[PDB]
């Protein structure tokens, strides 16, 4: 069954987690919107293969809001690694598999290459490397505005699925609704400069499976599939767009299990 | 000042032809389809910077029909390339540079490497790598069947620019029309196993630029990105889809000069 509980750190967030299974530890970090509830289907196809799979929402994000301002203002990817350290250290995960998507990709490769004894191998997804003034420039409208927009935003160009995007439900979408300004105040300004895919040789041979959405336009992540192809590591495609565990569950869930039994089976070679 | 014109290669080719200007030679091959009015705005634009713009149909498509079977039947890259010889040599084209999207990529990334002494330095956009079973499979269909499903194709799915697609007018579209059994049963099964993209230390140090579409979903030309990488070749996107040429001909226009032009000053 599901543990759904919360956890408060000594950087002063508390955190709202979900785990399930025994086993390797997962761990499903979100994107920048810091919704844990979009990986429910995956979190238990994933744990049934024997597998401890963790969540949480992000800090300032849905259940986890309760945190200082500094840990959702001028964002960084090195900021939201040293986050997760810190519930992995509160529920006592000494070594993870990861997989983030957006900012969650920035977080993992900071993950991976900060903190390489805890980190099994590492899963990104569509990891943002540009400025894009148009989403920028939503910090300065109202809270209403932002989120008017960014909602039609998610569900009409990166959801992947318009169909599984409305059908996370109210509840999900409410605290989504909250999230938005959080997110455009604290995100996109300082996320893309902070990507951790500066140093390609640093990337080199290292445990990372770097995916793009299928059918994400080839403009949006193109940046990802070179620095992956010039490092040598390992790149392909999901299904959908931005948020392969709401429009594809099942084959999210099949392709962090199988990633990470090839690691696992690497690990012990 | 375009000359629109027909040309008879010993091959067997009676090529529709147009050009225009006056300078170094840009040869714009078609895509699949074969239809060079798809470049009308362009070879003006382009040639209007001190270039001699030559395009044409292809063999067995649209004005360049006259051809015997073996040019429109198990269509390879290598095929093609030796056609497209044939008519630089007849127009007396002795060095070229060279554009292609789709199949027309295939063909020029075969003509630089094939004939190294004649090409200055190919564009190539789009170039298929992967048979693709739902197009393979319109080959065995009745005409009216493959016209209907691939003129709803083009204009819906990889037009990157519809309002433009239809504006190519009436005429052009009676000759896709005729074109798309052709093309089904002459290309999707035979083109891409022939990509001329096997060994990627062959395309390392040459005068090749690759494009993909922004707008292209990237699991379309996924592999073109990666094989660009891994050979060092410059790889990037031109707005729109599968027909740049089409949906945005000044944007296009302006890249085979600024390109053409790079490779003037790397030359000297
Ligand atoms: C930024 C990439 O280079 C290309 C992204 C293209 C998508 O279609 C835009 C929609 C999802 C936005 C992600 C995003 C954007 C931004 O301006 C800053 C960010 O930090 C993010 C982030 O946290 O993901
Ligand atoms: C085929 C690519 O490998 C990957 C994606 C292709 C586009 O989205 C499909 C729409 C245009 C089709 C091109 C195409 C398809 C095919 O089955 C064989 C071909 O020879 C071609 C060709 O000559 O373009
Ligand atoms: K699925
Ligand atoms: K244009």
């Known amino acids: 069954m599901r543990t759904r509980s ?22 499903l970090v979100p994107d920048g919107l810091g919704e844990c509830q979009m990986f429910d289907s995956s979190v238990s196809q994933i744990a049934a293969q024997g597998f401890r799979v963790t969540t949480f929402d992000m800090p300032g994000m849905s259940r986890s809001a309760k945190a200082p301002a500094e840990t959702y203002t001028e964002v960084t990817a090195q900021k939201l690694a040293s986050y997760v350290i810190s519930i992995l250290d509160a529920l006592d995960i000494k070594h993870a598999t990861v997989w983030g998507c957006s900012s969650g990709a920035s977080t993992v490769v900071a993950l991976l290459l900060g903190y390489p004894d805890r980190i099994r191998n590492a899963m990104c997804h569509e990891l943002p490397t540009k400025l894009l003034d148009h989403l920028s420039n939503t910090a300065v409208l109202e809270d209403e505005e932002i989120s008017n927009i960014l909602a039609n935003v998610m569900l009409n160009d990166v959801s992947g ?25 604290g995100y996109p300004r300082t996320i893309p400069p902070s990507a951790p895919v500066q140093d390609v040789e640093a990337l080199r041979g290292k445990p990372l499976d770097w995916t793009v959405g299928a059918a994400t336009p080839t403009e949006s992540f193109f940046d990802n599939i070179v620095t992956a192809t ?40």
Request: aromatic share 12%.
């Open 6 to 27: 919360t956890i408060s750190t000594p950087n002063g967030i508390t955190w709202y987690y979900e785990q399930e299974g025994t086993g390797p530890d997962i761990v």
């Open 161 to 185: 699925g318009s169909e599984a995007w409305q059908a996370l439900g109210v509840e999900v979408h409410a605290r989504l609704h909250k999230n938005y300004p959080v997110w455009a105040r």
């Open 230 to 269: 010039k490092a040598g590591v390992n790149i392909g495609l999901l299904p959908g767009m931005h948020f392969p565990y709401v429009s594809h569950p099942d084959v999210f869930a099949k392709y962090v299990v199988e990633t990470t039994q090839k690691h696992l089976w690497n690990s012990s070679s």
